[PDB]
Design a protein around this ligand. Structure first.
Ligand SMILES: CCCCCC/C=C/CCCCCCCC(=O)OC[C@H](COP(=O)([O-])OCC[N+](C)(C)C)OC(=O)CCCCCCCCCCCCCCCCC
Ligand SMILES: CCCCCC/C=C/CCCCCCCC(=O)OC[C@H](COP(=O)([O-])OCC[N+](C)(C)C)OC(=O)CCCCCCCCCCCCCCCCC
Lengths: 269, 289
């Protein structure tokens, strides 16, 4: 039910994004000893690229329908998106935290990359258990619902026969609210760390505009995509295109604000 | 309908909170010319307290059941919740923005003139966004109280079952659109508030600096909003639980915000009242990172 032209346009855009991701990964894995790239924690950024490619793969996985294994498909793509945005937004807050600590606590007077990776791993483990409880307690079982409903609002009586087919959990709002809440608290502390590391250093090493535009875009994208997924599900081309577009714009935007200053500073050196 | 003991304890707690708010209002009006209250923004504290009493009245109206036009009662409780939240979280952000501009514009001459009328204008713009969103919600898709009886014959992967579900809910037809809109606008506002709390993290003493109150309030706001949305959506067979949880969440959030705003002012009011020999008595209030 998906038009081939829309599918091709989306796949080409996501392939261009993935090629840019691979180019960034090669740049940050080759120029490790360069002063500019080493100043911006090159070993942490590999986690960001892995999260970015995971999100792009999930955006691809939104592009297939029509298989009784749709449930596994939706669970894999949603869990992949969750783990991907977790891995994207981990190291940015970690770098901001380390920059704040070396700016503040060094004045009265050192954090290694392993400590920030441990914080990132704890955050991923939280995401893993929060997804495991969802996939174990109530699955995303697809059911064919046929029902007749009588509408009596107190002034008129009418009857409606609805045959609605959808794929959703028994209590989907609990899981979306809890994942929303955990990610929102994370983005709130990220905005706090962005404020703390405000006008502290150069944008190649100071991640303040990057995290702010990423948090704002993540909030607006999540709201818009949840709205267009819940209500206008009878517009499958629109839902697929908007979901893939939101994921592509977000992932590319954060990755570009992370790595464009690095390449700009490397061009002059 | 609702249990009388829970209604009594909720009303008692909200009355105690409202009397606390009126006491803070009396202190702000009385000692407005005290040096540390003047170094805070008492006029903006008036707006914060007005939002606080609006959301306390919202929590009061959450208990009004089996009386009405209940569809209008839902509108008039949620609208005043949203307006009160705007009026509470506006002036704090304005004060933090003034602190950031005062302490990070260290240029000779060119002194910053940010009068209180500018910040009341910013709060008015935020409230204008609030009222246009609420007007669109009440005009396009109003909440209607509808009772529907229905039967559903669902089929699973291998089994067929039939359920006769009859329910009565009073909710919008496009409810999640309005929830996403208003929670999203509030979310952008509170994320910019977290940014301002970060920027002004070590800018002054806790009487003037509002980093901790912004961070605590924003975390409690997200937690309360998520929990109350879930328990309102999925627990209609437990009216006492949802009423108590909503009232307690509103009371806890508003009381912690107002206590965080006003308790250090009351603590440090004495130290800048009688002697006031030099401005060296307020040296931590001129601090910087
Ligand atoms: C770093 C760049 C990444 C940014 C990308 C952010 C965009 C996310 C949009 C994708 C999610 C939309 C999918 C809608 C749910 C769905 O598929 O339906 C199945 C169902 C919801 O069904 P439903 O409600 O959509 O339709 C049924 C309607 N009915 C009335 C019948 C119930 O989902 C669930 O079962 C619950 C599981 C939750 C999955 C976790 C969400 C993943 C989101 C990834 C972003 C994480 C961080 C953002 C959090 C907030 C940030 C502040
Ligand atoms: C400064 C401290 C303030 C603390 C207050 C924070 C707590 C807020 C709890 C709000 C409780 C909502 C009550 C739901 C009533 C209801 O059922 O209406 C029916 C509908 C939804 O119905 P329903 O889903 O709840 O039940 C019917 C179930 N059924 C499946 C059949 C639909 O709600 C709406 O339509 C609301 C439209 C939007 C109005 C916005 C309300 C204002 C919210 C508070 C101000 C914003 C502050 C929070 C933002 C923070 C962001 C993280």
């Amino acid at each position: 039910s998906l038009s081939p032209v829309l599918l091709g346009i989306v796949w080409t855009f996501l392939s261009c994004g993935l090629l840019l991701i691979l180019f960034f990964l090669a740049f940050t894995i080759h120029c490790r000893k360069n002063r500019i790239v080493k100043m911006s924690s090159p070993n942490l950024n590999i986690v960001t690229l892995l999260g970015s490619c995971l999100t792009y793969s999930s955006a691809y996985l939104f592009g297939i329908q029509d298989v009784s294994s749709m449930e596994t498909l939706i669970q894999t793509r949603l869990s992949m998106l969750c783990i991907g945005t977790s891995l994207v937004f981990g190291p940015i807050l970690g770098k901001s935290w380390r920059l704040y600590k070396v700016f503040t606590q060094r004045v009265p007077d050192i954090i290694k990359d392993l400590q920030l990776l441990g914080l990132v791993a704890a955050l991923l483990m939280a995401d893993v258990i929060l997804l495991m409880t969802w996939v174990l307690t109530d699955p995303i079982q697809c059911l064919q619902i046929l029902s007749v409903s009588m509408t009596v609002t107190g002034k008129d009586v009418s009857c409606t026969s609805t045959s609605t087919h959808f794929c959703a959990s028994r209590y989907s709002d609990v899981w979306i609210a809890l994942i929303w809440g955990c990610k929102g608290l994370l983005l709130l502390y990220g905005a706090y760390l962005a404020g703390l590391t405000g006008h502290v250093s150069s944008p190649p090493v100071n991640q303040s505009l990057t995290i702010m535009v990423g948090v704002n875009l993540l909030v607006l994208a999540a709201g818009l995509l949840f709205v267009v997924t819940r209500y206008l599900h009878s517009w499958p081309n629109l839902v697929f295109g908007l979901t893939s577009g939101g994921i592509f714009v977000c992932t590319t935007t954060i990755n570009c604000f992370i790595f464009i200053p690095q390449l700009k500073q490397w061009k002059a050196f």
